[PDB]
Amino acid sequence: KLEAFASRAKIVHIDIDSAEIGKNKTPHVSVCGDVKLALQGMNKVLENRAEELKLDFGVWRNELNVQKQKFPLSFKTFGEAIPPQYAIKVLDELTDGKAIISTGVGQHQMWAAQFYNYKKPRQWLSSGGLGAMGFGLPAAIGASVANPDAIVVDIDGDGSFIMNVQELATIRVENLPVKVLLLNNQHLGMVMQWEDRFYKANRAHTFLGDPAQEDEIFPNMLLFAAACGIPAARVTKKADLREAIQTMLDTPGPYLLDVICPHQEHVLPMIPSGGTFNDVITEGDGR
Amino acid sequence: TFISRFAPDQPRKGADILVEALERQGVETVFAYPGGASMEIHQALTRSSSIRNVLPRHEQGGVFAAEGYARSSGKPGICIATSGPGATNLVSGLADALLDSVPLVAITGQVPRRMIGTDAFQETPIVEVTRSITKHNYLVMDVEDIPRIIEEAFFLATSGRPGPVLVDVPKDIQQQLAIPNWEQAMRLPGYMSRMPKPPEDSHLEQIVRLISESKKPVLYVGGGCLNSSDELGRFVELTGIPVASTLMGLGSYPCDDELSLHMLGMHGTVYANYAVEHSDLLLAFGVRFDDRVTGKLEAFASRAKIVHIDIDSAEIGKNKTPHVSVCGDVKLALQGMNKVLENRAEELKLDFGVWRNELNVQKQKFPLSFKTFGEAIPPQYAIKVLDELTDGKAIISTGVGQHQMWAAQFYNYKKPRQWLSSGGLGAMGFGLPAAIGASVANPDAIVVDIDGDGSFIMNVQELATIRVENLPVKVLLLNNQHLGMVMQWEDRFYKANRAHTFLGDPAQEDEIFPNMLLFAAACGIPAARVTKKADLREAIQTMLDTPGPYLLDVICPHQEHVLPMIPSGGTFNDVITEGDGR
Amino acid sequence: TFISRFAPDQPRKGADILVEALERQGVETVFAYPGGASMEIHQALTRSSSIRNVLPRHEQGGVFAAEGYARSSGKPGICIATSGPGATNLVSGLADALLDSVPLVAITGQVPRRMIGTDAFQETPIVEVTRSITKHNYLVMDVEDIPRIIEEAFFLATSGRPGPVLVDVPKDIQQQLAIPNWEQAMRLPGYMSRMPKPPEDSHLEQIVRLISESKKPVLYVGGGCLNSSDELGRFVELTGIPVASTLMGLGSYPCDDELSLHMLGMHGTVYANYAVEHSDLLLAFGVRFDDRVTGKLEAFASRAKIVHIDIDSAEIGKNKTPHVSVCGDVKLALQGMNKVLENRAEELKLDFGVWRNELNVQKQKFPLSFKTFGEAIPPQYAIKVLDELTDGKAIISTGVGQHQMWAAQFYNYKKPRQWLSSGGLGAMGFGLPAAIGASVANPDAIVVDIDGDGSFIMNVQELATIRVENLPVKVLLLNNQHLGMVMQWEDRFYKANRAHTFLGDPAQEDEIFPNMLLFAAACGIPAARVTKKADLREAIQTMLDTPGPYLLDVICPHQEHVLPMIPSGGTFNDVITEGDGR
């Protein structure tokens, strides 16, 4: 809700597109130009007038650090089931946060944004404006070609991954070290989450497996990688997760890791469409 | 409580629904020219006892009359035309109303729906033609959409930034019988969600904050203040900031006032452009930063903190990026700032008398000046006499050219909506029909068309409309026998090489051609010509005192130039202050 | 071998390249009205010794003059206007030239390229506006494209189905110095591959085959035959098929001939519509099956094998599906059919005298008739006198309305391009400017504008153009003090309820208003009014014999109706043959 967004703030908007300034939220001060130059100019002013300004926001920072400790990013671990949030956090640890991450679109896309600490820009490749499924696998191809000596990992969902699964042939032929961290929940997870919250968990074509063999992982993504000569492996128990991801990273060339996850997980926190901060959802799942 | 001429259960023609849709909007006057496609609408107009039609002699005159009706009253102007050649004759008026943000609703007849696209008799895709020169347009495809579309058309034409809205109505829809539903909801969800909110106090506080911190503030007032004359005057009493006005905002703040810098821009006063050049705070209220005002954008207000208030978000930062911006109604922004400036009056201690005297020095050293040659009539002097004899309380419409600038320079408009002139498009032939619409909307008003001999002749046929409708339209025709504005640019930038700018007869080179008095005689309008400056005061007085229409042919030396002048894309240091074509 | 005014290595302004591009196309006359955006072009025109400019008083007059120039000569008509209000005033002429397939090239000035889209001074997207009412248009974005675009513009405007082409030229391109390349290849690959080929013998054999097998053939001739008068006449000698013509094809086959069925359609003769109704072979040469000719399409030529020859493939089978079709030049198709009909002459033994006498019976029982009331002047009789006194060899331009139909009915045009009338769009105010362009293209010709009092006044300002350019334009003004055509439809279908069709002054109801003689007096044009039928013959003779311009105000009783009349969408059995508004 635009009226409630930054309702108490003087808004300074710097943007290189004049059509975006005052488009949805009218600012007080505006600068139409390169934010890179605007920062360089402001840094020189803040450096000369340093002792004159005596800037200190430690009181405001601690007001936020209180909210940071009382409402942190949290995930629940059920038995030996793999939490998708935990899997991404392990990938962060084992890659030292220096990997190029491309994602599909859905729940896995949010968890890749939440539980990975990107240290430099252009490590995070994700469809945000259009939100196009099937983006993750091909985008990793282009990232690996532009950065041959880089760790490229596609954190994809089972729905997004299959849409452009044909590009596994491209990865093998071009011999690209593309890693596929496939978070498999056998569902169109994001749509499933909205069904649980706002449609009484009434499933409307969000299950991606085979209803005949309801408890069988379908499709068998390992055989997609096998068809294109790509080493593959599946991990289901949380204890085996750390070694499985390490094997994916250490194995030269392409690799696909089918990470089975409980589908009842929800991306948290969540503000419903057109809501305010006081409408934030901080707890709950589909169980 | 509206009283219909039909029972709530009685089916009626779509044309009769269209007319009643106008009655429910408060429409009292339309400018309709009949044709095969709109005959049903014209029949339905005769059945209306509240809507009066002014039949023009050219649809371009009909739409220009609808503009004058709108500009001189604030009500929307309604013009109606038939399909094909009728609709295409409205094009200049639609584009003109869009560039000047004039509320206007144009209704065009159209071929029956089954014939659209078949190159039928008198068919043009008027919606496709006018999409880029209208605020919005419609093609009615069912008779039940007439109440909704007419309501949406008037709402879009008058709300927000006003503009023209065209409604194309096929003939079969005009004939189809139906029962209208007047309670339908308008289907404008995105436009109504984009409507600016009333301004927030936080934005208004920072503007008043910047006023107290400034030393050389200038008000940059334009056509957006035509409904804020009281709020703007109150704002000036509380701040004492000099007011520079655009050609569209003339009258928002009185030109005869001590704090008035008059017009700024290409032909604005030297002191008004000087104030903006060496200002530190530019209050741009209801303007659009046109090239005629700014010139070289980098040099325009190069030392000023720019505050831009505008109801169209697309205009904020479009050509000149401001520091503080407010997207909303300048009328409300002034009301909010007046309350702050009144409570915090003694706290702020606003006084810009030092900056005002720096401008009053430029006002006395570079004032608006004209030279008088022998007994020849100076056009500037003629307009100043009209100002004196009308007490500055006349409605002035103009054509486009040199006479248009002198009417803006040498007339002191006291209230807005006295100045009707084509500024954005600059369409010749606007003056005479616009005076028709102004006189109809203000029957007890002095309406004078300060026209040029080139502009006047373009829609001279509307003299018949003035006589038939018995409108007290005065025509102060400044006759220089030339396309004066183009002639001036020839003298300055093309070594006075005439390229089809003389309007007289080269055979009888010293004869006034055409004889405009006989144009007025053909339409039974009293006319007179004055050539000697001594006879000018009595001639204009005769025009005003003679009841009904009157045309005064004022002969002027053609070598006059509009001064001052800043060339296209120039700066303040490029201002031309002297010279003519002699 | 063309002789330039500049060295092959000498850079010149883009405007000077534009003018030379016109010289290399054979342009001798343009109709240009100056403005800020096109000032460079007007300066470059004065440097040309071969291109003469006729300055109009309204750009709508400029484009209508360019039409008359084109329609009366077969050359393309060139009109030039400035940006914004200048360009928008051409709109009615562009749409009019498109619907009537008139070769026309319009050049409009435009704001500098850097300012396009910024709502600059006098800017309208004229290319976006006129895309649907022009055959093609351009926006020149570089000075080096001027030779190519001007060549493509004239090629598209004149080849195939002719039409208007607009070229938008920004001001900075007019000022940019360059060296033109006159040898550039036109980039019209798809259009030139779609150009129809010369007709094949197999198609022509089957047409002549169907002629011998037919017993009631009718020629359906239209504006596509304006360049095939000789070939069409030869075709008629070899077949003896009666010729029914559209309003656009009048003159292709002589109206005074024994085999001429005159005009067909809504206001066509009873015998011409009868021939098409009971025909077995309809030779549709150069027509487009307009609703004015067909009415209810199912009933139009319901018993006829339809042969449609047309150079536009989009018109074949568009409204009426033919049996045999030929897509190409009707001039070539006639030449090919004439050779077959001449060799196989005695083999075919063509004789339709039995069908011709069936039509000559309808010709004698239902001829074009007018009633004479007292000494009042019948408009039909006035036009027939003009035919007699000019020997039928005059160039006739008309407005739109009742007078337009009577000029088509009661004048026997002997050659094509004598009849200049707005048929597709039907734009009032066409007659007077079109006569200007016709007189300029044919200085030694009798040019008469048969105008109506409503149409004449719309572009009455062009009377100044006629005087200044000293053009022998005669104005036969049929004055009925009404919008006659709309008045006729009111009497027939709206119980004579007048809805804004009276053009005089209701105060002085019996006074001729306006006094058109004073319009001509204002522009120094000899004028006279005639009211009694006895004085009519001498009055028209005085108009013709008086050198230079002349206006003859012919007063007519307004209750006259154009007869016969087929209502909109009717059949032949719905023809109205008698009645008026008394």
Ligand SMILES: Cc1cc2nc3c(=O)[nH]c(=O)nc-3n(C[C@H](O)[C@H](O)[C@H](O)COP(=O)(O)OP(=O)(O)OC[C@H]3O[C@@H](n4cnc5c(N)ncnc54)[C@H](O)[C@@H]3O)c2cc1C
């Ligand atoms: C020959 C000629 C010479 C000219 N020379 C000059 C000249 O020297 N000087 C000059 O000033 N003009 C000149 N012009 C006129 C000109 O080109 C422009 O029309 C004018 O400069 C711009 O007017 P404006 O800035 O007031 O904007 P407008 O066209 O009047 O539009 C109003 C602006 O305010 C906003 N607005 C409207 N309503 C509201 C509201 N209720 N609240 C808040 N905002 C609102 C609109 O969004 C728009 O941006 C000339 C014209 C001609 C034909």
Ligand SMILES: Cc1cc2nc3c(=O)[nH]c(=O)nc-3n(C[C@H](O)[C@H](O)[C@H](O)COP(=O)(O)OP(=O)(O)OC[C@H]3O[C@@H](n4cnc5c(N)ncnc54)[C@H](O)[C@@H]3O)c2cc1C
């Ligand atoms: C008030 C009024 C009343 C009217 N009433 C009538 C009426 O009763 N009767 C009437 O006929 N009109 C009437 N019209 C005129 C009208 O609406 C149309 O313009 C006319 O009917 C159609 O003309 P057309 O068939 O010759 O086609 P045009 O508009 O002349 O086009 C020519 C056709 O031939 C083709 N062509 C062009 N050149 C060639 C070539 N070299 N070779 C082969 N083909 C070519 C073109 O592709 C096009 O299809 C009236 C107009 C008005 C204003």
Ligand SMILES: Cc1ncc(C[n+]2c([C@@](C)(O)OO)sc(CCOP(=O)(O)OP(=O)(O)O)c2C)c(N)n1
């Ligand atoms: C081409 C395309 N088609 C459909 C889409 C509509 N959406 C989504 C959304 C957010 O855009 O909803 O608007 S997300 C989504 C399902 C995500 O399946 P997953 O890959 O398994 O990821 P997860 O980890 O399980 O959640 C769909 C169907 C889409 N974006 N792209």
Ligand SMILES: Cc1ncc(C[n+]2c([C@@](C)(O)OO)sc(CCOP(=O)(O)OP(=O)(O)O)c2C)c(N)n1
């Ligand atoms: C429909 C139309 N066509 C051409 C125009 C281009 N202009 C002008 C301009 C400023 O728009 O130049 O760009 S002004 C002008 C000539 C003015 O003739 P006047 O009426 O006699 O007035 P004056 O007192 O003598 O100067 C022309 C030809 C125009 N605007 N409208």
Ligand SMILES: Cc1ncc(C[n+]2c([C@@](C)(O)OO)sc(CCOP(=O)(O)OP(=O)(O)O)c2C)c(N)n1
């Ligand atoms: C720019 C324009 N505006 C309106 C038009 C709609 N029409 C007509 C029509 C056939 O197009 O009806 O559809 S004819 C007509 C009136 C004719 O007035 P007159 O000149 O006096 O001729 P007359 O000898 O008296 O009959 C009008 C109003 C038109 N065509 N052009």
Ligand SMILES: COc1cc(OC)nc(NC(=O)NS(=O)(=O)N(C)S(C)(=O)=O)n1
């Ligand atoms: C009043 O003068 C005339 C003249 C005239 O032709 C001579 N025809 C008509 N009427 C129609 O044409 N009706 S229609 O066929 O439904 N149309 C295509 S339309 C929408 O009206 O253009 N009126």
Ligand SMILES: COc1cc(OC)nc(NC(=O)NS(=O)(=O)N(C)S(C)(=O)=O)n1
């Ligand atoms: C001759 O009369 C006038 C009047 C006038 O204003 C008063 N301005 C100009 N000249 C320009 O405007 N040049 S320009 O700035 O490049 N244009 C935007 S344009 C293409 O010409 O419209 N001529």
Ligand SMILES: [Mg+2]
């Ligand atoms: Mg854990």
Ligand SMILES: [Mg+2]
């Ligand atoms: Mg999934």
Ligand SMILES: [Mg+2]
């Ligand atoms: Mg004096």
Ligand SMILES: [Mg+2]
């Ligand atoms: Mg006119």
Ligand SMILES: [Mg+2]
């Ligand atoms: Mg003039």
Ligand SMILES: [Mg+2]
């Ligand atoms: Mg007789």
Ligand SMILES: [Mg+2]
């Ligand atoms: Mg008439």
